[PDB]
Design a protein around this ligand. Structure first.
Ligand SMILES: [Cl-]
Ligand SMILES: [Cl-]
Ligand SMILES: [Cl-]
Ligand SMILES: [Cl-]
Ligand code: NA
Length: 129
């Protein structure tokens, strides 16, 4: 599913991402924009053989099981395919664990390089929140 911007903001808010670990909702919408262009079916293969999945491009090296990343972890205890669903619950629950790891949202390369330090509230402007 390709979410509209406000549609994604509302789903992320409802699932408790807004201000999670101190990251305002605009940070999460911006991260999703540049990680997946709001497409839940986005995938990208990494050089090491792991794959990133879903709206927040969560990596199989640590966070989900895809059965094709030998020696990897599954810290969110989910199949990576669950991160491609139209329902973002699994992606949100897993992103909460990722952001709680020591580097916060710097875990998302696109957030660090394209969102961090910018006017992130503009990503939720106009939305009825
Ligand atoms: Cl914000
Ligand atoms: Cl695996
Ligand atoms: Cl949803
Ligand atoms: Cl932080
Ligand atoms: Na894995």
């Amino acid at each position: 599913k390709v979410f509209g911007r406000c549609e994604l903001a509302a789903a992320m808010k409802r699932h408790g991402l807004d201000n999670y670990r101190g990251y305002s909702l605009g940070n999460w919408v911006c991260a999703a924009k540049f990680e997946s262009n709001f497409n839940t079916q986005a995938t990208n293969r990494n050089t090491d053989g792991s794959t990133d999945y879903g709206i927040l491009q969560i990596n199989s090296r640590w966070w989900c099981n895809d059965g094709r990343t030998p020696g990897s972890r599954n810290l969110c205890n989910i199949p990576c395919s669950a991160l491609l669903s139209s329902d973002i619950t699994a992606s949100v629950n897993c992103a909460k664990k990722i952001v709680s790891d020591g580097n916060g949202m710097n875990a998302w390369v696109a957030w660090r390089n394209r969102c961090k330090g910018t006017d992130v509230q503009a990503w939720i402007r106009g939305c009825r929140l």
